[PDB]
């Protein structure tokens, strides 16, 4: 229905706003673009499902997210990929892991404060009906 399309449009506006706030945070720069194979050739082979904030924006605009739960799965993937790719004790790896956890924690905190639970429930019920 048109009311349901309005609901998903509001969801997309909300998700673009959250994503923009993450993307402008200097700590999260490493997560804003796909990994360049010229700089890191072994990435594309170790990480089977890459994800980054630019790809998240593209997915919002392609209407790939019908709930915040599905968006958070991709935030979780950005973080889990970073932990997997940077598992060593060396400070470069530890810095990226700390930033990855901060990205995840920040996204969840914004959503806890700003997502209305009944709005998310409505999205989930529309999604389940299709």
Ligand X SMILES: CC(=O)c1csc(NC(=O)[C@@H](C)[NH3+])n1
Note the residues at the interface with ligand X (CB under 6 A).
30, 35, 40, 82, 85-86, 92-93, 96
Q: With contact defined as beta carbons under 8 Å apart, do 12 and 59 qualify?
A: no
**Minimum CB–partner distance for residue 37 and ligand X (Å):** 11
- For residues 51 and 30, give the distance between their C-alpha atoms in angstroms, rounded to a whole number: 11
Work out the angle at residue 9's Cα, subtended by the Cα atoms of residues 73 and 12, and round it to the nearest 5 degrees.
35
**Residue whose C-beta lies closest to ligand X:** 92
Alpha carbons within 13 A on the beta-carbon side of 54: 8
Collapsed DSSP state (helix, strand, coil) of residue 67: coil
Largest CA distance in the chain: 53
**Minimum CB–partner distance for residue 109 and ligand X (Å):** 21
Please identify, using beta-carbon distances, which residue of 92 and 130 lies nearer to ligand X: 92
**Minimum CB–partner distance for residue 85 and ligand X (Å):** 5
Please identify, using beta-carbon distances, which residue of 50 and 70 lies nearer to ligand X: 50
Please identify, using beta-carbon distances, which residue of 67 and 86 lies nearer to ligand X: 86
Nearest CA-CA partner of 101 in 116, 74, 79: 79
Please identify, using beta-carbon distances, which residue of 35 and 56 lies nearer to ligand X: 35
**Minimum CB–partner distance for residue 22 and ligand X (Å):** 14
């Amino acid at each position: 229905s048109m009311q349901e399309e309005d609901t998903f449009r509001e969801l997309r506006i909300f998700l673009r706003n959250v994503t923009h706030r993450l993307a402008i945070d200097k700590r999260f720069r490493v997560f804003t673009k796909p990994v360049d194979p010229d700089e890191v050739p072994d990435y594309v082979t170790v990480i089977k499902q890459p994800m980054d904030l630019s790809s998240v924006i593209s997915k919002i605009d392609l209407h790939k997210y019908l709930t915040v739960k599905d968006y958070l799965r991709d935030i979780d993937l950005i973080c889990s990929n970073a932990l997997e790719y940077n598992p060593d004790r060396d400070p470069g790896d530890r810095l990226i892991r700390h930033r990855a956890c901060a990205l995840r924690d920040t996204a969840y905190a914004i959503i806890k404060e700003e997502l209305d639970e009944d709005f998310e429930q409505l999205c989930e019920e529309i999604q389940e009906s299709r």
